[PDB]
Amino acid sequence: SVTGGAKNFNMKPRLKSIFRRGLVKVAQTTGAWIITGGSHTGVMKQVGEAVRDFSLSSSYKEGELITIGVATWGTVHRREGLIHPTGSF
Amino acid sequence: IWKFQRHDLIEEYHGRPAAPPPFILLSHLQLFIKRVVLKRHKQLKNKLEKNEEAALLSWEIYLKENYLQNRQFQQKQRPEQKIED
């Protein structure tokens, strides 16, 4: 479970390097479950990008590093389109 | 030298029309009347989709950083490097 700064986050390049190799390398072998906050800002964006390019560069490899995000229902921008009374399949 | 010499022959025959030369006039007439009124083949040079080329270049720039670590790591195993360390 990775946590960090959401809206006001700044990082040196050396810190950026560990997310690309250290977090992804230790996530991809063991078959982990990266759980984090669901947001497009800050550190969660860094985890979201650094897990995406692995799936492209995997060259049709089996399995994907599964990622589950948890955020509050209140602070969502366009959630009025999400509420469907029937099963929004 | 031969493997380098291999290419241009395949080029010249790829560009050539298909007829044996007693019938190559049948090819010359259609091309001469098409260039009378008003481009490589798309198997040796093609302008890709922009949206495709972005994905291809991102894949490339991913793979470069994977090359560089092995390069510098095996460069750390020369003996002169060990003596310096």
What are the C-alpha distances in Å from A33 to residues A2, A23, B47, B82?
11, 12, 41, 41
Asked if A28 and A54 touch (Cβ cutoff 8 Å), the reply is yes
Give me the long-range contacts of B53-58 (CB less than 8 A, separation at least 24). Answer: B55/A56, B58/A53, B58/A56
Rounded Cα distance between B69 and A9, Å, is 28
Identify residues of B whose CB sits under 8 angstroms from chain A CBs: 55, 58-59, 62-63, 65
Method in brief: cryo-EM
Q: B32: which residues sit within 8 A by CB, 6+ positions away?
A: none
- Rounded CA-CA distance B41/A71 in Å is 53
CA distance A43 to A63: 24
CB within 8 Å: A56 and B63: no
Query: Distance of CA B29 to CAs A1, A31, B22, B32, B40, Å?
Result: 72, 65, 13, 5, 19
* Closest by CA position to A5, among listed A52, A41, A38, A48: A41
**What phi-psi label fits residue B20: left (phi over 0), alpha (psi between -120 and 50 degrees) or beta?**
beta
Rounded to whole angstroms, how far apart are CA atoms B78 and B85? 11
Nearest 5°: CA angle at A42, between A36 and A45? 60
Cα–Cα dist B59/B79, whole Å: 35
First to last CA, chain A: 29
Q: Supply A75's token pair.
A: 């602070």
Diameter of chain A measured on Cα atoms: 48
Q: Which residues of B touch A20 (CB under 8 A)?
A: 65
Chain A contact set for B62 (CB, 8 A):
53, 56-57
Contacting A residues, span 30-59, partner chain B, CB-CB under 8 Å: 53, 56-57
Q: In a 3-state reduction of DSSP, which class is residue A49?
A: helix
Other Cβ atoms less than 10 A from the Cβ of A18: the count is 13
CA nearest to A56 within chain B? B59
Contact A56 B59 (CB under 8 A): yes
What are the φ/ψ torsions at residue A70 (nearest 5 degrees)? Answer: -130, 120
Distance between CA B79 and CA B82 in Å, rounded? 5
A25 vs B58: CA distance, rounded Å = 20
